[PDB]
Amino acid sequence: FEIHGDNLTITDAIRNYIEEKIGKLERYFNDVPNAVAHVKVKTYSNSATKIEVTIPLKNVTLRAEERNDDLYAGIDLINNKLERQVRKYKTRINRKSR
Amino acid sequence: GQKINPIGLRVGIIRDWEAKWYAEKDFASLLHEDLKIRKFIDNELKEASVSHVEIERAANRINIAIHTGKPGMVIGKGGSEIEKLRNKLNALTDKKVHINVIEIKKVDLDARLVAENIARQLENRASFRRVQKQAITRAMKLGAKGIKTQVSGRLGGADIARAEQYSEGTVPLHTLRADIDYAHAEADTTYGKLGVKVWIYRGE
Amino acid sequence: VPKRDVLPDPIHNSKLVTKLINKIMLDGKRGTAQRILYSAFDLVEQRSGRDALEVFEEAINNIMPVLEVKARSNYQVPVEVRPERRTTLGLRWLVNYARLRGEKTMEDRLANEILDAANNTGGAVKKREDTHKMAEANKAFAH
RNA sequence: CUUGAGUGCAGAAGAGGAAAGUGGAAUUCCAUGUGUAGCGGUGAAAUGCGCAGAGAUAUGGAGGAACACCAGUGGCGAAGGCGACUUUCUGGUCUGUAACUGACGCUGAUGUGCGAAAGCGUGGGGAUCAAACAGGAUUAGAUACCCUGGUAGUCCACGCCGUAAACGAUGAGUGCUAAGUGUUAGGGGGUUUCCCGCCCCUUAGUGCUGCAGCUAACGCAUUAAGCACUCCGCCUGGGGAGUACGACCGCAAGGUUGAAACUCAAAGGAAUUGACGGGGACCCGCACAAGCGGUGGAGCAUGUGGUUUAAUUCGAAGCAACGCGAAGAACCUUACCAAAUCUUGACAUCCUUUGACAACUCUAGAGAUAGAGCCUUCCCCUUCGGGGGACAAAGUGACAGGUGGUGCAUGGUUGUCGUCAGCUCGUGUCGUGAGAUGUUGGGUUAAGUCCCGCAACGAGCGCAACCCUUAAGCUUAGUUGCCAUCAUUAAGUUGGGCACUCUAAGUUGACUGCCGGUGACAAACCGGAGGAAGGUGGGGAUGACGUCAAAUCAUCAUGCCCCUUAUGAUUUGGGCUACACACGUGCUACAAUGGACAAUACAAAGGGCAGCGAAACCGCGAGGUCAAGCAAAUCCCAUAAAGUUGUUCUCAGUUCGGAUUGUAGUCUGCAACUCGACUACAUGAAGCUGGAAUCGCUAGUAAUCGUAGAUCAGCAUGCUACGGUGAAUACGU
């Protein structure tokens, strides 16, 4: 994922935080083809901390975003979304007769 | 897509070229020659409110003919203006002219005239919509088969961009035999830029 | 929806050569395909010399199946083939095995294959076998 | 006093209850026989059972449970509940009669008793089933679903507990208020030779549909949620909370009664619109499928990231950024950096002072530029001046300028879902109201395509159509184009002809149009004839309402802010291209379907003015010399490649391979070191079809081989356009 920051300079602190979080999804299933992160300071002028995230999946993908006061609140709030946006999928359950 | 004024899609079939001269590869000279005239007419825009002008260029001369609704203005009483326009033009064209005004009939039905009209009543601190109400009102009056009239920008001198248009009269647009005269305008007072995109349908 | 017929073979007045040169016709190059195939009709008609159609027609009745399978939860059904698909797939494993000898010539691998296949041997008679071991093994739960 | 109530008299039905007593199937087990190797269960398996003989089959025995079909929107019950049969006891209900009493009635706090299943105790019995529980499997994980088993209990009596969605979410009783239709127990009348057949009326219960009326609306409507009366109980925003304390009951579990502190400005009901569904019905789609060909594997390029840096310029990114902006970074460009630099400034207008506006060198400078020499030198008008196109340097203050910021201040412009088939309104109706109607039901088309039916009718945008190209012919005209009859040249070269092809503009043509069939005859659909072309012939253009606060202040313009001896502007050089690396995209190899070499056939399109440079000449070739022709149907650019004919190589890391590095050169540029391409010589890296995963495509398509054009001094593995060759698959959804 092109962890790029518009008007905010991605430190190693931020990269560590991010990747750390998505590691937790190895519960299901990782399977790590790619992942992206869009972060930006969009002045309102209360002015943001925007987070938009993208997950490419097996035979499909799931984007995810959210805004909040600061970067860490945006990464934590956008979490618990790209998990339930993922869970569930399958099973599906057998037939025919006849 | 998404959309284009059909004039580009209608031209080459149902209308003349907007500027004309013999077909030689010295176009960078002659096109940018035409433009030097096309600029200067804006001085007359504030005085003439003409629709447009298409130039011919005879074998050693030039002919232009201006589509105005203000004949006696531009003619003056007895041509006290047209001739110093020949020479102030010829001064810059480095070559002579034979202007011959081509007055507008039917008369103030046209798109461009009405376009900058409503833009200017708007520029004089007007609730925008009523201007289009009286516009369309005198539009179906004069006899026309299809109209709408669109506006963009920060309306009423206020917060973020908006838009509106009043559609009345059936307007064949996706056709190719419509022969309709699209227009555009630009005028602000204090807050940004509020152009319009009028439409008509008269004949085929 | 129709299948864009080929008229005759202009060589020996058969047809399926034409259907077969086009399967050698890679890159849209016909002449090299036609070349190497008719050459193979020289080689196989030389070795144990005979008509084209003995080794050819026999071999393509030694590998050219009668039943195939298809999936549909997932239950693989044995199915009767439409004869265009039958002949189609016969020639499919024909060329698609012809390279798979792993040899040098344009034609020996071919003429080896059709000669061998006229004799009910090689991987094309084999895929007929194994295919018909998926048929009547899988009669039960999907027919 | 009887019309209320009740007793009587004669009738009727009933899974009404309690106790008792028999009967049969069916499961489980056991004994026995037969008899061999699996049974059982699952989405798929295993747990389990099986050689000690299972399961199956068959006879018999055991004993516990619940009592099939009948069974009904059927009945009975006050409520819970009540379904094998028979017996004993017993209550209750409806009908009709009425002679008896003679208003004795309704409700009912308190109070009192009945009361699902679960559960507790004293015992008993204990087949099936199964909490708990043990185990397997599933799951990222599974104490759970799922499978295997198994306890309590389920069961009887006796006691206790006293709750429920205990629901008609509708308190008891009395009485009136339209219909129609059924089912149950009766009664009465008629008809029928006898009503068993049938008709009519009535009581009671029971369901269904529906006026009035009510209703917030859903909806109830003679079994009222209508109309009124009498009696009881219950409610006062939600949460906290039916909770705590207290009191009574209970063996206990728990129950009954039942608050506040503080908190919130909402909580909630009916219905409407839109969306969503791990819902359904239908339909279309390289979405599947059936095929073919690719990425990812090696080297190269390119953009980006990441790294770096004095600078390595700005932005753009899921499909819809990543061969994009930028359709050409050596300087220029360049925005970035260094230095040398200027300030009404790089440049623009106005006011003032003049003027035709300055070429060639010298000095220094890196140039910028200065120092000078120097020739820019009122040209049109002028009556003596002035006016004036255009000027010098200076002043002049506005100002100039900002690639300084804000694409969420905007316009403009453009991608997107989507070339999908939909999207609105005027009028009227409906409805408290939002809102619906039209736009719905049936068919049909690719489509809101049409037709039918319809409180809807009409109109709009949208599709098609209209236009461009293409396939056939007719005409018009014949050069630079063609040679058919010819004669003729090396050569359509010359004569001649425009006949042919060709050539650009108006013609005719395809429109379910003609027919046949299918079809609510209509809509249409299937088929057939002809026709060059049959089902909108193929493609192009056109992209609805609109979503994405999509993108762009760096196209242009611009609201606002900021700067102004600099956040502006000038010059020489650097840099925008660095690389441990990664992402995308393309290119080239991994070879005999082939590589090396010789001879030979075939296009389309399009460029050209001082550009296209014919032949000849030089050269290993890039290129260098010369110069015919030609603003093009001409001449030139420019010769097609794949292919065809052969020869050889004969399966090697090979004549595969073609990166690497050096050497020697050509072109352009003032200048090819950071940073141009190409030619000759050598050197010969990795790499044998790429792993999981992953992408496109339905016919001239894919795939492959060529060609030109722009961008240009120089320069495209890119883009655009042109052709050559040229298949496999498409069942079905």
PDB file of N, CA and C in Angstrom, chain A residues 22-79:
ATOM      1  N   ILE A  22      -2.836  -3.971  11.271  1.00  0.00           N
ATOM      2  CA  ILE A  22      -3.367  -4.919  10.294  1.00  0.00           C
ATOM      3  C   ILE A  22      -2.817  -6.319  10.544  1.00  0.00           C
ATOM      4  N   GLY A  23      -1.710  -6.421  11.275  1.00  0.00           N
ATOM      5  CA  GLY A  23      -1.212  -7.717  11.690  1.00  0.00           C
ATOM      6  C   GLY A  23      -2.249  -8.506  12.468  1.00  0.00           C
ATOM      7  N   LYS A  24      -3.069  -7.802  13.251  1.00  0.00           N
ATOM      8  CA  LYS A  24      -4.086  -8.421  14.095  1.00  0.00           C
ATOM      9  C   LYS A  24      -5.123  -9.186  13.283  1.00  0.00           C
ATOM     10  N   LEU A  25      -5.294  -8.818  12.013  1.00  0.00           N
ATOM     11  CA  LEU A  25      -6.266  -9.485  11.157  1.00  0.00           C
ATOM     12  C   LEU A  25      -5.807 -10.857  10.688  1.00  0.00           C
ATOM     13  N   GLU A  26      -4.624 -11.315  11.103  1.00  0.00           N
ATOM     14  CA  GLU A  26      -4.167 -12.648  10.723  1.00  0.00           C
ATOM     15  C   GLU A  26      -5.078 -13.728  11.287  1.00  0.00           C
ATOM     16  N   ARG A  27      -5.886 -13.370  12.285  1.00  0.00           N
ATOM     17  CA  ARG A  27      -7.128 -14.073  12.534  1.00  0.00           C
ATOM     18  C   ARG A  27      -7.849 -14.441  11.242  1.00  0.00           C
ATOM     19  N   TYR A  28      -7.930 -13.536  10.273  1.00  0.00           N
ATOM     20  CA  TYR A  28      -8.555 -13.872   9.005  1.00  0.00           C
ATOM     21  C   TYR A  28      -8.071 -12.932   7.902  1.00  0.00           C
ATOM     22  N   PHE A  29      -7.184 -13.372   6.996  1.00  0.00           N
ATOM     23  CA  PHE A  29      -6.384 -14.614   7.064  1.00  0.00           C
ATOM     24  C   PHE A  29      -4.910 -14.354   6.742  1.00  0.00           C
ATOM     25  N   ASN A  30      -4.651 -13.341   5.914  1.00  0.00           N
ATOM     26  CA  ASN A  30      -3.316 -12.773   5.742  1.00  0.00           C
ATOM     27  C   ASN A  30      -2.254 -13.780   5.296  1.00  0.00           C
ATOM     28  N   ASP A  31      -2.243 -14.277   4.051  1.00  0.00           N
ATOM     29  CA  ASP A  31      -2.893 -13.753   2.832  1.00  0.00           C
ATOM     30  C   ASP A  31      -2.747 -12.239   2.616  1.00  0.00           C
ATOM     31  N   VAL A  32      -1.514 -11.763   2.453  1.00  0.00           N
ATOM     32  CA  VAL A  32      -1.229 -10.330   2.362  1.00  0.00           C
ATOM     33  C   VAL A  32      -0.797 -10.027   0.927  1.00  0.00           C
ATOM     34  N   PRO A  33      -1.741  -9.740   0.019  1.00  0.00           N
ATOM     35  CA  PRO A  33      -1.352  -9.354  -1.340  1.00  0.00           C
ATOM     36  C   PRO A  33      -0.931  -7.892  -1.426  1.00  0.00           C
ATOM     37  N   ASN A  34      -1.648  -7.008  -0.722  1.00  0.00           N
ATOM     38  CA  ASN A  34      -1.369  -5.572  -0.739  1.00  0.00           C
ATOM     39  C   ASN A  34      -2.252  -4.843   0.266  1.00  0.00           C
ATOM     40  N   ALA A  35      -1.886  -3.608   0.618  1.00  0.00           N
ATOM     41  CA  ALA A  35      -2.801  -2.705   1.303  1.00  0.00           C
ATOM     42  C   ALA A  35      -2.338  -1.260   1.203  1.00  0.00           C
ATOM     43  N   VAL A  36      -3.291  -0.329   1.234  1.00  0.00           N
ATOM     44  CA  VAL A  36      -3.044   1.077   0.936  1.00  0.00           C
ATOM     45  C   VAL A  36      -3.520   1.902   2.125  1.00  0.00           C
ATOM     46  N   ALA A  37      -3.113   3.170   2.193  1.00  0.00           N
ATOM     47  CA  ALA A  37      -3.632   4.097   3.192  1.00  0.00           C
ATOM     48  C   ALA A  37      -3.583   5.537   2.708  1.00  0.00           C
ATOM     49  N   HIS A  38      -4.741   6.191   2.665  1.00  0.00           N
ATOM     50  CA  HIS A  38      -4.846   7.605   2.324  1.00  0.00           C
ATOM     51  C   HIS A  38      -5.158   8.380   3.593  1.00  0.00           C
ATOM     52  N   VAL A  39      -4.293   9.335   3.899  1.00  0.00           N
ATOM     53  CA  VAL A  39      -4.403  10.198   5.064  1.00  0.00           C
ATOM     54  C   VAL A  39      -4.201  11.635   4.604  1.00  0.00           C
ATOM     55  N   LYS A  40      -4.944  12.574   5.191  1.00  0.00           N
ATOM     56  CA  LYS A  40      -4.874  13.951   4.710  1.00  0.00           C
ATOM     57  C   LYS A  40      -5.356  14.946   5.754  1.00  0.00           C
ATOM     58  N   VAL A  41      -4.796  16.153   5.683  1.00  0.00           N
ATOM     59  CA  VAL A  41      -5.235  17.296   6.475  1.00  0.00           C
ATOM     60  C   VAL A  41      -6.059  18.205   5.569  1.00  0.00           C
ATOM     61  N   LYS A  42      -7.383  18.104   5.662  1.00  0.00           N
ATOM     62  CA  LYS A  42      -8.308  18.879   4.832  1.00  0.00           C
ATOM     63  C   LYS A  42      -8.928  19.963   5.707  1.00  0.00           C
ATOM     64  N   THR A  43      -8.484  21.206   5.530  1.00  0.00           N
ATOM     65  CA  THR A  43      -8.921  22.280   6.412  1.00  0.00           C
ATOM     66  C   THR A  43     -10.399  22.603   6.223  1.00  0.00           C
ATOM     67  N   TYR A  44     -11.107  22.703   7.351  1.00  0.00           N
ATOM     68  CA  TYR A  44     -12.510  23.072   7.423  1.00  0.00           C
ATOM     69  C   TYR A  44     -12.847  24.460   7.992  1.00  0.00           C
ATOM     70  N   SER A  45     -11.997  25.182   8.758  1.00  0.00           N
ATOM     71  CA  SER A  45     -10.614  24.938   9.234  1.00  0.00           C
ATOM     72  C   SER A  45     -10.515  24.279  10.625  1.00  0.00           C
ATOM     73  N   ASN A  46     -11.536  23.518  11.040  1.00  0.00           N
ATOM     74  CA  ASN A  46     -11.376  22.657  12.212  1.00  0.00           C
ATOM     75  C   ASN A  46     -10.500  21.464  11.842  1.00  0.00           C
ATOM     76  N   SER A  47     -10.645  21.024  10.599  1.00  0.00           N
ATOM     77  CA  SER A  47      -9.590  20.656   9.660  1.00  0.00           C
ATOM     78  C   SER A  47      -8.986  19.273   9.518  1.00  0.00           C
ATOM     79  N   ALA A  48      -9.121  18.328  10.443  1.00  0.00           N
ATOM     80  CA  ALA A  48      -9.485  16.952  10.102  1.00  0.00           C
ATOM     81  C   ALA A  48      -8.718  16.035  11.032  1.00  0.00           C
ATOM     82  N   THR A  49      -8.864  14.743  10.803  1.00  0.00           N
ATOM     83  CA  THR A  49      -7.723  13.944  10.385  1.00  0.00           C
ATOM     84  C   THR A  49      -8.260  12.774   9.580  1.00  0.00           C
ATOM     85  N   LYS A  50      -8.264  12.933   8.259  1.00  0.00           N
ATOM     86  CA  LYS A  50      -8.967  12.020   7.377  1.00  0.00           C
ATOM     87  C   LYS A  50      -8.172  10.737   7.218  1.00  0.00           C
ATOM     88  N   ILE A  51      -8.895   9.625   7.181  1.00  0.00           N
ATOM     89  CA  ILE A  51      -8.319   8.310   6.954  1.00  0.00           C
ATOM     90  C   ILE A  51      -9.208   7.586   5.958  1.00  0.00           C
ATOM     91  N   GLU A  52      -8.616   7.133   4.857  1.00  0.00           N
ATOM     92  CA  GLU A  52      -9.284   6.247   3.915  1.00  0.00           C
ATOM     93  C   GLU A  52      -8.335   5.103   3.617  1.00  0.00           C
ATOM     94  N   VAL A  53      -8.852   3.886   3.703  1.00  0.00           N
ATOM     95  CA  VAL A  53      -8.052   2.673   3.664  1.00  0.00           C
ATOM     96  C   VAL A  53      -8.669   1.724   2.655  1.00  0.00           C
ATOM     97  N   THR A  54      -7.836   0.873   2.071  1.00  0.00           N
ATOM     98  CA  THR A  54      -8.242  -0.036   1.014  1.00  0.00           C
ATOM     99  C   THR A  54      -7.652  -1.396   1.334  1.00  0.00           C
ATOM    100  N   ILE A  55      -8.466  -2.434   1.192  1.00  0.00           N
ATOM    101  CA  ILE A  55      -8.046  -3.808   1.428  1.00  0.00           C
ATOM    102  C   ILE A  55      -8.391  -4.596   0.167  1.00  0.00           C
ATOM    103  N   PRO A  56      -7.403  -5.084  -0.594  1.00  0.00           N
ATOM    104  CA  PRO A  56      -7.696  -6.086  -1.627  1.00  0.00           C
ATOM    105  C   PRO A  56      -7.737  -7.485  -1.043  1.00  0.00           C
ATOM    106  N   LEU A  57      -8.784  -8.232  -1.374  1.00  0.00           N
ATOM    107  CA  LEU A  57      -9.086  -9.503  -0.737  1.00  0.00           C
ATOM    108  C   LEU A  57      -8.986 -10.631  -1.766  1.00  0.00           C
ATOM    109  N   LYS A  58      -9.221 -11.849  -1.291  1.00  0.00           N
ATOM    110  CA  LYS A  58      -9.318 -13.025  -2.143  1.00  0.00           C
ATOM    111  C   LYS A  58     -10.585 -12.928  -2.986  1.00  0.00           C
ATOM    112  N   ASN A  59     -10.422 -12.734  -4.298  1.00  0.00           N
ATOM    113  CA  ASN A  59     -11.540 -12.678  -5.244  1.00  0.00           C
ATOM    114  C   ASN A  59     -12.402 -11.432  -5.037  1.00  0.00           C
ATOM    115  N   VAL A  60     -11.898 -10.513  -4.217  1.00  0.00           N
ATOM    116  CA  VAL A  60     -12.612  -9.289  -3.882  1.00  0.00           C
ATOM    117  C   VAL A  60     -11.758  -8.421  -2.948  1.00  0.00           C
ATOM    118  N   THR A  61     -12.205  -7.191  -2.694  1.00  0.00           N
ATOM    119  CA  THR A  61     -11.502  -6.267  -1.806  1.00  0.00           C
ATOM    120  C   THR A  61     -12.513  -5.428  -1.035  1.00  0.00           C
ATOM    121  N   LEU A  62     -12.052  -4.739   0.006  1.00  0.00           N
ATOM    122  CA  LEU A  62     -12.939  -3.909   0.815  1.00  0.00           C
ATOM    123  C   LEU A  62     -12.288  -2.609   1.267  1.00  0.00           C
ATOM    124  N   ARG A  63     -12.788  -1.496   0.739  1.00  0.00           N
ATOM    125  CA  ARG A  63     -12.276  -0.181   1.094  1.00  0.00           C
ATOM    126  C   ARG A  63     -12.854   0.234   2.441  1.00  0.00           C
ATOM    127  N   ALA A  64     -12.179   1.158   3.115  1.00  0.00           N
ATOM    128  CA  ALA A  64     -12.632   1.626   4.417  1.00  0.00           C
ATOM    129  C   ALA A  64     -12.037   2.990   4.721  1.00  0.00           C
ATOM    130  N   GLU A  65     -12.838   3.872   5.308  1.00  0.00           N
ATOM    131  CA  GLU A  65     -12.363   5.210   5.630  1.00  0.00           C
ATOM    132  C   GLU A  65     -12.824   5.699   6.995  1.00  0.00           C
ATOM    133  N   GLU A  66     -12.931   7.017   7.125  1.00  0.00           N
ATOM    134  CA  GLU A  66     -13.350   7.643   8.369  1.00  0.00           C
ATOM    135  C   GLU A  66     -12.528   8.897   8.627  1.00  0.00           C
ATOM    136  N   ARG A  67     -13.161   9.837   9.331  1.00  0.00           N
ATOM    137  CA  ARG A  67     -12.542  11.076   9.765  1.00  0.00           C
ATOM    138  C   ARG A  67     -12.633  11.152  11.277  1.00  0.00           C
ATOM    139  N   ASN A  68     -11.686  11.859  11.882  1.00  0.00           N
ATOM    140  CA  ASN A  68     -11.737  12.090  13.316  1.00  0.00           C
ATOM    141  C   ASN A  68     -10.714  13.172  13.637  1.00  0.00           C
ATOM    142  N   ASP A  69     -10.554  13.447  14.934  1.00  0.00           N
ATOM    143  CA  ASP A  69      -9.712  14.552  15.371  1.00  0.00           C
ATOM    144  C   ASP A  69      -8.260  14.384  14.940  1.00  0.00           C
ATOM    145  N   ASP A  70      -7.645  13.238  15.237  1.00  0.00           N
ATOM    146  CA  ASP A  70      -6.220  13.037  14.998  1.00  0.00           C
ATOM    147  C   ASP A  70      -5.990  11.669  14.375  1.00  0.00           C
ATOM    148  N   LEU A  71      -4.747  11.459  13.932  1.00  0.00           N
ATOM    149  CA  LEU A  71      -4.414  10.273  13.146  1.00  0.00           C
ATOM    150  C   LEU A  71      -4.703   8.999  13.926  1.00  0.00           C
ATOM    151  N   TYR A  72      -4.335   8.977  15.203  1.00  0.00           N
ATOM    152  CA  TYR A  72      -4.461   7.746  15.963  1.00  0.00           C
ATOM    153  C   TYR A  72      -5.933   7.430  16.230  1.00  0.00           C
ATOM    154  N   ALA A  73      -6.753   8.460  16.454  1.00  0.00           N
ATOM    155  CA  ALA A  73      -8.182   8.221  16.617  1.00  0.00           C
ATOM    156  C   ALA A  73      -8.809   7.781  15.307  1.00  0.00           C
ATOM    157  N   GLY A  74      -8.288   8.281  14.187  1.00  0.00           N
ATOM    158  CA  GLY A  74      -8.801   7.862  12.899  1.00  0.00           C
ATOM    159  C   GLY A  74      -8.456   6.425  12.571  1.00  0.00           C
ATOM    160  N   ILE A  75      -7.269   5.965  12.981  1.00  0.00           N
ATOM    161  CA  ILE A  75      -6.896   4.579  12.715  1.00  0.00           C
ATOM    162  C   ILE A  75      -7.643   3.653  13.654  1.00  0.00           C
ATOM    163  N   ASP A  76      -7.980   4.129  14.849  1.00  0.00           N
ATOM    164  CA  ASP A  76      -8.661   3.247  15.784  1.00  0.00           C
ATOM    165  C   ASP A  76     -10.156   3.199  15.492  1.00  0.00           C
ATOM    166  N   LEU A  77     -10.732   4.321  15.068  1.00  0.00           N
ATOM    167  CA  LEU A  77     -12.148   4.344  14.721  1.00  0.00           C
ATOM    168  C   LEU A  77     -12.413   3.598  13.419  1.00  0.00           C
ATOM    169  N   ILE A  78     -11.538   3.765  12.425  1.00  0.00           N
ATOM    170  CA  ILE A  78     -11.708   3.030  11.174  1.00  0.00           C
ATOM    171  C   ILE A  78     -11.515   1.541  11.408  1.00  0.00           C
ATOM    172  N   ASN A  79     -10.774   1.180  12.448  1.00  0.00           N
ATOM    173  CA  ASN A  79     -10.773  -0.200  12.879  1.00  0.00           C
ATOM    174  C   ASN A  79     -12.146  -0.541  13.436  1.00  0.00           C
TER     175      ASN A  79
END
